[PDB]
């Protein structure tokens with residue numbers, strides 16, 4: 406029981422999030438069906454099953470906002486979910502965060518072994534780029550090439566991998582970071598893929614990305630604050646991964662620096678910032694407004 | 706002489722391109738590890754890109770993006786292959802491996818970011834004025850590199866290590882096709898793809914070249930000198946691997962590699978003498994000491 410009903414999320418948001426999760430899973434199923442039945446591929450399927458699909462949902466809903474067909478947008482939605490999944494397979498490794506459970510199930514290296522986890526994460530990164538450049542993703546090659554270039558910049562040693570590297574350099578020193586420092590780290594480690602996801606609908610429509618980029622800056626920070634709160638107050642049965650971890654690793658997080666009350670308040674302010682950033686879209690962006698409430702109020 | 710000069714110049718060009726691109730990233734250990742992992746090498750795959758581009762009258766200043774891309778992808782694959790959980794190698798290209806010099810996390814992440822960089826490099830607008838070309842280069846790269854291509858090969862290779870019986874010739878050949886054939890095939894087809902030209906002849910060339918290359922790599926593991934090859938030798942027997950030498954013997958493996966030179970060369974007939982550097986590359990892949 407995730408306690409979702411108790412939160413009274415808007416009907417359209419709930420229906421659309423449920424449909425997006427089923428659509429992403431169906432697309433992974435179809436794409437992976439073409440691959441050989443070997444442990445690495447089974448591990449790819451394991452690692453991509455489940456999840457909230459926030460990032461894939463952002464792609465689908467920003468595409469909807471820009472009148473892009475769902476049948477095209479699914480490619481980019483699945484792509485970002487593949488990229489995200491790869492990052493978690495590697496993060497969970499013994500040499501990194503060393504976690505035994507993810508999404509309520511054993512992690513890849515636990516169910517198989519470390520080599521299988523390394524390779525499944527490697528192939529999932531590759532699959533993200535296959536999915537965004539597949540001709541089904543857009544009738545425009547310029548759009549596909551730009552989606553892939555942007556994804557590489559979000560994902561690599563200026564984006565997500567940079568954030569990871571900085572995080573590890575902190576874990577190892579058990580170092581005390583300022584609020585600015587953990588914010589710069591967050592921007593790479595988690596902000597970059599959420600930014601790519603929210604900008605995707607505009608990129609697919611060859612439209613201005615500025616409003617969705619601003620939206621995503623707020624949303625991503627709210628999301629990370631919420632994640633840091635769940636580590637402190639959350640229930641491992643609901644969250645599907647171990648909690649209480651950050652303290653033991655000597656991690657400065659938004660909660661360790663600000664305290665819970667002020668972290669919650671900051672996340673609440675960021676809902677407003679995120680919603681304000683959508684003003685130019687008017688009512689058509691209402692699902693994306695409710696997404697900002699979800700990212701803070703979710704139990705998992 | 707002209708072949709050797711072209712190869713030397715290509716190696717310098719690829720190193721210069723890595724030096725430019727990587728200097729734009731922050732000066733952190735992960736980026737230092739990316740530079741470490743991409744330095745050196747024969748640059749066979751990059752050279753294939755540059756020379757098949759030349760063949761198809763593509764500008765060298767465009768082709769360098771794809772040449773550096775395939776070298777980044779290849780470099781990533783070696784950083785992960787060398788890991789303790791994989792082949793557990795302490796030396797590569799005469800230098801410590803990334804996990805030895807740094808640590809396993811840094812190796813995992815550097816390899817990750819090098820894969821990502823490969824896709825950044827092919828999709829950068831410099832790679833081609835045609836977005837159709839860039840999207841095609843990226844899509845084909847992903848299909849060559851992932852779990853239908855290079856990673857498939859790696860998965861098959863690891864499964865072989867605890868197979869009940871040694872692999873047959875057909876089985877190690879299918880393994881080779883994924884593990885080393887795929888990236889070599891991408892590299893050779895790159896010039897045709899850059900020109901939106903027919904890839905069939907270069908795909909055939911590369912099927913032969915890649916198999917000859919692996920047979921040669923298997924021969925070097927058996928007869929080669931670690932000081933010359935830059936990595937440990939005798940590894941295959943230690944792991945109990947079926948290889949082309951274990952299945953054929955050295956004499957017959959050498960003769961097969963020579964037969965595949967002829968096949969590679971015949972594949973280029975439609976190009977005439979404009980393809981001579983590619984013919985010399987096939988002879989190189991079998992002659993080479995490292």
Ligand SMILES: CC(C)=CCC/C(C)=C/CSP(=O)(O)OP(=O)(O)O
Pocket residue numbers: 491492493495496502565566569594595632646814817
């Ligand atoms: C493996 C690479 C390059 C980057 C990892 C990016 C990433 C999303 C890290 C996880 S943030 P973290 O707070 O550690 O996430 P949970 O395990 O708590 O779900």
Ligand SMILES: CC(C)=CCC/C(C)=C/CSP(=O)(O)OP(=O)(O)O
Pocket residue numbers: 524527781782783785786792855856859884885922936
């Ligand atoms: C890490 C992944 C997915 C693939 C590795 C692909 C690759 C080129 C492996 C090396 S084949 P191998 O004969 O083992 O190469 P050497 O170490 O002998 O140079």
Ligand SMILES: C=C(C)CCOP(=O)(O)OP(=O)(O)O
Pocket residue numbers: 455456457458459489508594595632705
């Ligand atoms: C970036 C972070 C904090 C990793 C977990 O992300 P999610 O909380 O979105 O995980 P899933 O829904 O994909 O399981």
Ligand SMILES: C=C(C)CCOP(=O)(O)OP(=O)(O)O
Pocket residue numbers: 745746747748749779798884885922995
């Ligand atoms: C695919 C294999 C057999 C890995 C080594 O390839 P190379 O022998 O081309 O290595 P470098 O020149 O890049 O060092």
Ligand SMILES: [Ca+2]
Pocket residue numbers: 496497502
């Ligand atoms: Ca973690």
Ligand SMILES: [Ca+2]
Pocket residue numbers: 502572576
């Ligand atoms: Ca961590």
Ligand SMILES: [Ca+2]
Pocket residue numbers: 632633636
């Ligand atoms: Ca966390």
Ligand SMILES: [Ca+2]
Pocket residue numbers: 786787792
């Ligand atoms: Ca090896």
Ligand SMILES: [Ca+2]
Pocket residue numbers: 792862
């Ligand atoms: Ca091996």
Ligand SMILES: [Ca+2]
Pocket residue numbers: 922923926
């Ligand atoms: Ca070898």
